[PDB]
Design a protein around this ligand. Structure first.
Ligand code: MG
Ligand code: MG
Ligand code: MG
Ligand code: MG
Ligand code: MG
Ligand code: MG
Length: 210
DNA sequence: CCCGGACCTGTGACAAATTGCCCTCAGACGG
DNA sequence: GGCCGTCTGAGGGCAATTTGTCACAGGTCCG
């Protein structure tokens, strides 16, 4: 199945995208890499890749596409818009898109890799972000261990403000996304909290492959 | 000493958003 | 040649779940 590769700078960028937008973003990076920034998406293929009907595929593409407007990406810092022209459809079932050509060197560079089947059943976009960050440290055999700082997670993944309260961070982000990864990917993941005084400061992730 | 106060945790409620489903009808194509 | 039946997808919706927010119960240590 398709092997996604991406620069760590994208793995670690600050941005806010939905699941459907992130799904589309994987094919663009795939299209770009197999070679101006102009990409294309076919409704009937998207539906087959992600096990959707044509109707619901059309809905996902149309709404993802119109929600890119105004979205910006920050590399730590430097900000860019993802698109420099609205999307548009020349043919029935076909969409054409214009990625900011200045984003090319950030996609292709110190890199992150995974096959697309690893991520296509994850639902929560923050769990997609976390799984991409763990892959960045994965070893050939399939295991790894990394300590991520809580403030950096909140900035990079652009978590909403109520997750600055640690019990809400635990309940609605960490536990849920560790549970998805363990149920929906081939990775088996555990973690432990690092503290300093009363504040919890980092999360230490260990994982191996099934 | 005990207190009020500034920290921390977890849970019950409720509001806002997202999920996979369902139904309609015209476009593109070929037999 | 040209009409029509089928495969698509572009629309309009839905209720059941999940995600985002905040009040209050309950712990510690400080001055
Ligand atoms: Mg979202
Ligand atoms: Mg959808
Ligand atoms: Mg403190
Ligand atoms: Mg008393
Ligand atoms: Mg009680
Ligand atoms: Mg008290």
């Amino acid at each position: 199945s398709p092997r996604i590769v991406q620069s760590n700078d994208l793995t670690e960028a600050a941005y806010s995208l939905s699941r459907d937008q992130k799904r589309m973003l994987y094919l663009f990076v795939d299209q770009i890499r197999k070679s101006d920034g102009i990409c294309e998406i076919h409704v009937a293929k998207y539906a087959e890749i992600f096990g959707l009907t044509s109707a619901e595929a059309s809905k996902d593409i149309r709404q993802a596409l119109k929600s890119f407007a105004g979205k910006e990406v920050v590399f730590y810092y430097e900000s860019f818009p993802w698109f420099i022209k609205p999307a548009h459809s020349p043919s029935r079932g076909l969409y054409s898109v214009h990625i900011n050509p200045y984003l090319i060197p950030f996609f292709i560079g110190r890199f992150t890799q995974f096959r697309l089947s690893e991520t296509k059943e994850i639902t929560n976009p923050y769990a997609m972000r976390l799984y991409e960050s763990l892959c960045q440290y994965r070893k050939p055999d399939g295991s790894g261990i990394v300590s991520l700082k809580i403030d950096w997670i909140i900035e990079r993944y652009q978590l909403p403000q109520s997750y600055q309260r640690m019990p809400d961070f635990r309940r609605r982000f960490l536990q849920v996304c560790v549970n998805e990864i363990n149920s929906r990917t081939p990775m088996r993941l555990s973690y432990i909290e690092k503290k300093k005084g009363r504040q919890t400061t980092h999360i230490v992730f260990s994982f191996r492959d099934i």
